């Protein structure tokens, strides 16, 4: 129930 595509390079 999580993602690591539009958050990794989106959070920083």
3-state SS of 1-12 is CCCCCCCHHHHC
Method: NMR
Residue 12 C-beta-side C-alpha neighbours within 13 Å: 4
Dist. CA 7–CA 3, nearest whole Å: 7
Structure tokens at 2: 């999580």
Residues 6+ apart with CB under 8 A from 9: none
Quote the CA–CA distance of 1 and 3 in Å, as a whole number: 7
Distance CA 10, CA 12 (A): 6
């Amino acid at each position: 129930k999580r993602i690591v595509k539009r958050i990794k390079k989106w959070l920083r």
